[PDB]
């Protein structure tokens, strides 16, 4: 298992991991530039990815993970660790992401990597695209 930044040449790798929610090249390019996004692979096989960016919240920075995918707890843990280290080296105050409670592997990985789960819940109103 290894963890590294991804580039445009990794589009197919990320999309092999993305299920029915593809990653566009535009999204790949944005996230490759943040310094907080990574890909996991076991040998040549893609095993996970994390898309994240720094968000100023007025007094401090949160690194917000938009998306994480992973085929094993090990992959997810290592991605969490890479995101956390990129946040820590940059003096970022916290790392946040949204957990779907049915994703049991991610729940296990978050806990193992020292994340507090809840009690805040995501409230969303979808307006749609032009």
XYZ file of N, CA and C in Angstrom:
390
model
N 0.840 -1.247 0.000
C 0.000 0.000 0.000
C 0.854 1.268 0.000
N 0.595 2.177 -0.945
C 1.252 3.476 -0.992
C 0.285 4.623 -1.180
N 0.706 5.813 -0.751
C -0.152 6.989 -0.806
C 0.624 8.118 -1.473
N -0.008 8.839 -2.381
C 0.686 9.892 -3.136
C -0.279 10.897 -3.696
N 0.217 12.053 -4.135
C -0.618 12.968 -4.893
C -1.013 12.286 -6.171
N -2.148 12.679 -6.735
C -2.533 12.228 -8.064
C -2.377 13.340 -9.081
N -2.314 12.959 -10.360
C -2.227 13.911 -11.469
C -3.306 13.570 -12.508
N -3.345 14.323 -13.596
C -4.309 14.073 -14.674
C -4.176 12.661 -15.255
N -2.976 12.093 -15.229
C -2.805 10.758 -15.779
C -3.570 9.711 -14.924
N -3.975 10.094 -13.701
C -4.736 9.209 -12.766
C -6.272 9.249 -12.860
N -6.791 9.948 -13.854
C -8.235 10.065 -13.997
C -8.920 8.694 -13.997
N -8.407 7.751 -14.777
C -9.030 6.427 -14.883
C -8.942 5.670 -13.570
N -7.817 5.800 -12.878
C -7.624 5.218 -11.547
C -8.695 5.686 -10.562
N -8.920 6.999 -10.485
C -9.918 7.538 -9.569
C -11.332 7.078 -9.952
N -11.588 7.032 -11.257
C -12.901 6.645 -11.754
C -13.141 5.127 -11.578
N -12.093 4.312 -11.589
C -12.252 2.925 -11.192
C -12.745 2.801 -9.748
N -12.418 3.773 -8.913
C -12.830 3.760 -7.508
C -14.153 4.495 -7.240
N -14.642 5.255 -8.212
C -15.689 6.243 -7.964
C -17.145 5.697 -8.029
N -17.327 4.440 -8.401
C -18.667 3.876 -8.551
C -19.527 4.684 -9.515
N -20.769 4.964 -9.138
C -21.731 5.670 -9.997
C -21.650 7.179 -9.848
N -20.626 7.664 -9.152
C -20.414 9.091 -8.992
C -19.027 9.439 -9.556
N -18.923 9.615 -10.860
C -17.625 9.866 -11.488
C -16.933 11.117 -11.019
N -15.609 11.137 -11.186
C -14.809 12.320 -11.041
C -14.512 12.855 -12.436
N -14.828 14.124 -12.629
C -14.533 14.809 -13.886
C -13.071 15.254 -13.883
N -12.521 15.535 -15.062
C -11.137 16.012 -15.151
C -10.974 17.348 -14.430
N -11.958 18.231 -14.607
C -11.999 19.514 -13.917
C -11.908 19.362 -12.408
N -12.682 18.449 -11.842
C -12.633 18.190 -10.410
C -11.259 17.644 -9.999
N -10.720 16.749 -10.821
C -9.402 16.165 -10.568
C -8.365 17.269 -10.502
N -8.399 18.175 -11.468
C -7.414 19.250 -11.553
C -7.471 20.229 -10.406
N -8.673 20.574 -9.990
C -8.863 21.426 -8.801
C -8.262 20.776 -7.556
N -8.598 19.526 -7.344
C -8.196 18.860 -6.109
C -6.726 18.482 -6.081
N -6.116 18.284 -7.259
C -4.689 17.957 -7.357
C -3.863 19.152 -6.912
N -4.427 20.342 -7.045
C -3.752 21.578 -6.671
C -3.828 21.985 -5.180
N -4.625 21.319 -4.341
C -4.824 21.858 -2.998
C -3.659 21.552 -2.061
N -2.940 20.474 -2.324
C -1.999 19.913 -1.383
C -2.629 19.007 -0.298
N -3.924 18.704 -0.396
C -4.615 17.929 0.622
C -5.333 16.690 0.072
N -5.148 16.441 -1.224
C -5.789 15.344 -1.944
C -4.748 14.261 -2.281
N -5.172 12.994 -2.160
C -4.334 11.835 -2.319
C -5.057 10.649 -2.949
N -4.236 9.717 -3.407
C -4.638 8.454 -3.986
C -3.871 7.370 -3.223
N -4.549 6.257 -2.956
C -3.980 5.045 -2.416
C -3.901 3.947 -3.481
N -2.792 3.221 -3.544
C -2.669 2.056 -4.435
C -1.856 0.914 -3.761
N -2.290 -0.306 -4.029
C -1.584 -1.527 -3.639
C -0.958 -2.104 -4.899
N 0.365 -1.990 -4.997
C 1.061 -2.254 -6.240
C 0.483 -1.291 -7.249
N 0.090 -1.815 -8.400
C -0.527 -1.026 -9.473
C -2.043 -0.846 -9.339
N -2.653 -1.499 -8.354
C -4.090 -1.456 -8.217
C -4.529 -0.255 -7.376
N -5.399 0.590 -7.918
C -5.952 1.709 -7.161
C -6.790 1.219 -5.991
N -6.639 1.836 -4.834
C -7.335 1.337 -3.642
C -8.188 2.369 -2.939
N -7.974 3.644 -3.250
C -8.777 4.702 -2.664
C -8.334 6.088 -3.110
N -9.161 7.085 -2.811
C -8.765 8.476 -2.987
C -9.429 9.396 -1.980
N -8.810 10.559 -1.779
C -9.378 11.619 -0.958
C -9.271 12.939 -1.637
N -10.406 13.613 -1.731
C -10.482 14.949 -2.299
C -10.744 15.921 -1.153
N -9.854 16.880 -0.963
C -9.952 17.784 0.156
C -9.300 19.127 -0.194
N -9.696 20.153 0.547
C -9.190 21.508 0.366
C -9.241 22.262 1.689
N -8.474 23.338 1.786
C -8.502 24.211 2.953
C -9.650 25.246 2.799
N -10.441 25.398 3.857
C -11.562 26.336 3.949
C -11.334 27.210 5.213
N -11.075 28.506 5.016
C -11.068 29.501 6.107
C -12.468 29.700 6.683
N -12.563 29.645 8.005
C -13.836 29.795 8.693
C -13.897 31.037 9.595
N -12.957 31.949 9.387
C -12.992 33.253 10.022
C -11.831 33.481 10.969
N -11.503 32.456 11.772
C -10.401 32.466 12.778
C -9.318 31.421 12.509
N -9.677 30.444 11.701
C -8.858 29.273 11.516
C -9.261 28.542 10.253
N -8.399 27.628 9.823
C -8.651 26.780 8.664
C -9.141 25.395 9.059
N -10.151 24.922 8.341
C -10.572 23.531 8.348
C -10.162 22.927 6.996
N -9.537 21.770 7.008
C -9.394 21.012 5.765
C -10.645 20.145 5.672
N -11.464 20.472 4.691
C -12.698 19.774 4.418
C -12.494 18.716 3.340
N -12.818 17.480 3.694
C -12.749 16.380 2.751
C -14.106 16.320 2.075
N -14.134 16.679 0.798
C -15.313 16.508 -0.044
C -15.733 15.068 -0.308
N -14.737 14.235 -0.591
C -14.981 12.867 -0.927
C -13.840 11.946 -0.510
N -14.177 10.823 0.080
C -13.215 9.731 0.262
C -13.837 8.401 -0.140
N -13.074 7.620 -0.911
C -13.417 6.273 -1.330
C -12.252 5.370 -1.017
N -12.529 4.091 -0.840
C -11.507 3.153 -0.406
C -12.030 1.742 -0.361
N -11.222 0.775 -0.790
C -11.672 -0.598 -0.885
C -11.310 -1.393 0.367
N -10.614 -0.765 1.302
C -10.283 -1.416 2.572
C -10.113 -0.393 3.674
N -10.294 -0.839 4.914
C -10.010 -0.015 6.076
C -8.562 0.492 6.033
N -7.611 -0.355 5.634
C -6.213 0.088 5.545
C -6.015 1.262 4.592
N -6.670 1.214 3.440
C -6.556 2.280 2.462
C -7.149 3.572 3.017
N -8.314 3.452 3.646
C -9.005 4.609 4.191
C -8.203 5.245 5.339
N -7.666 4.394 6.222
C -6.841 4.899 7.297
C -5.645 5.642 6.765
N -4.980 5.085 5.755
C -3.757 5.709 5.275
C -4.066 7.014 4.606
N -5.224 7.103 3.964
C -5.645 8.363 3.312
C -5.967 9.424 4.356
N -6.654 9.016 5.415
C -6.960 9.919 6.518
C -5.641 10.453 7.094
N -4.664 9.562 7.251
C -3.388 9.984 7.824
C -2.657 10.957 6.954
N -2.705 10.739 5.641
C -2.058 11.647 4.700
C -2.743 12.986 4.710
N -4.075 13.006 4.691
C -4.793 14.290 4.761
C -4.460 15.017 6.073
N -4.488 14.295 7.192
C -4.204 14.894 8.498
C -2.780 15.470 8.562
N -1.810 14.732 8.033
C -0.432 15.230 8.010
C -0.311 16.469 7.116
N -1.002 16.524 5.966
C -0.924 17.704 5.093
C -1.572 18.916 5.805
N -2.623 18.655 6.575
C -3.243 19.696 7.389
C -2.303 20.133 8.526
N -1.713 19.177 9.244
C -0.878 19.486 10.390
C 0.364 20.319 9.988
N 1.065 19.894 8.936
C 2.273 20.607 8.456
C 1.970 22.033 8.025
N 0.748 22.274 7.574
C 0.309 23.598 7.174
C -0.302 24.408 8.294
N -0.292 23.910 9.521
C -0.862 24.663 10.636
C -2.376 24.754 10.610
N -3.032 23.851 9.883
C -4.487 23.817 9.775
C -5.088 23.300 11.096
N -6.153 23.949 11.543
C -6.701 23.720 12.898
C -7.433 22.359 13.048
N -8.164 21.948 12.006
C -8.915 20.699 12.069
C -9.132 20.120 10.670
N -9.468 18.837 10.644
C -9.849 18.125 9.439
C -11.286 17.663 9.635
N -12.146 17.912 8.657
C -13.553 17.521 8.783
C -13.969 16.769 7.552
N -14.867 15.808 7.746
C -15.550 15.167 6.638
C -16.907 14.602 7.039
N -17.715 14.258 6.046
C -19.086 13.828 6.325
C -19.160 12.348 6.197
N -19.646 11.709 7.256
C -19.786 10.283 7.315
C -21.242 9.843 7.097
N -21.426 9.009 6.090
C -22.658 8.305 5.920
C -22.552 7.136 6.885
N -23.463 7.044 7.856
C -23.387 6.018 8.902
C -23.431 4.577 8.401
N -23.904 4.353 7.187
C -23.912 3.017 6.611
C -22.526 2.573 6.101
N -21.582 3.504 5.998
C -20.254 3.195 5.507
C -19.391 2.757 6.681
N -19.360 1.454 6.914
C -18.863 0.909 8.163
C -17.378 0.888 8.164
N -16.783 0.648 7.002
C -15.333 0.699 6.891
C -14.762 2.099 7.154
N -15.351 3.119 6.560
C -14.951 4.494 6.819
C -15.165 4.872 8.279
N -16.271 4.420 8.882
C -16.525 4.687 10.306
C -15.385 4.111 11.172
N -15.026 2.846 10.918
C -13.931 2.199 11.594
C -12.628 2.970 11.385
N -12.351 3.364 10.161
C -11.093 4.088 9.875
C -11.010 5.467 10.577
N -12.110 6.212 10.568
C -12.157 7.520 11.234
C -11.839 7.419 12.745
N -12.520 6.505 13.396
C -12.296 6.185 14.799
C -10.870 5.788 15.087
N -10.306 4.934 14.236
C -8.950 4.476 14.436
C -7.972 5.627 14.278
N -8.329 6.630 13.475
C -7.456 7.768 13.247
C -7.846 9.025 14.063
N -8.586 8.818 15.149
C -8.794 9.840 16.162
C -9.835 10.877 15.823
N -10.797 10.563 14.963
C -11.838 11.525 14.613
C -13.006 11.388 15.575
N -13.573 12.510 16.011
C -14.860 12.533 16.726
C -15.998 12.470 15.727
N -16.925 11.549 15.942
C -18.054 11.353 15.040
C -19.294 11.974 15.645
N -19.882 12.951 14.952
C -21.032 13.667 15.451
C -20.642 14.472 16.684
N -21.616 15.108 17.333
C -23.052 14.921 17.056
C -23.684 15.810 15.981
N -22.929 16.686 15.345
C -23.503 17.564 14.338
C -23.857 16.751 13.076
N -24.937 17.165 12.435
C -25.542 16.453 11.349
C -25.587 17.460 10.170
N -25.334 16.965 8.979
C -25.389 17.784 7.777
C -26.834 18.074 7.347
N -27.141 19.355 7.204
C -28.387 19.824 6.661
C -28.114 20.474 5.312
N -28.858 20.061 4.286
C -28.599 20.478 2.926
C -29.871 20.850 2.214
N -29.822 21.926 1.456
C -30.912 22.220 0.565
C -30.369 22.326 -0.855
N -30.887 21.483 -1.748
C -30.384 21.432 -3.103
C -31.220 22.343 -4.006
N -30.532 23.266 -4.659
C -31.147 24.252 -5.537
C -31.045 23.842 -7.003
N -29.977 23.146 -7.341
C -29.764 22.711 -8.689
C -28.814 23.601 -9.449
N -28.507 23.142 -10.651
C -27.578 23.834 -11.533
C -28.283 24.595 -12.621
N -27.687 25.716 -13.011
C -28.106 26.360 -14.231
C -27.837 25.433 -15.429
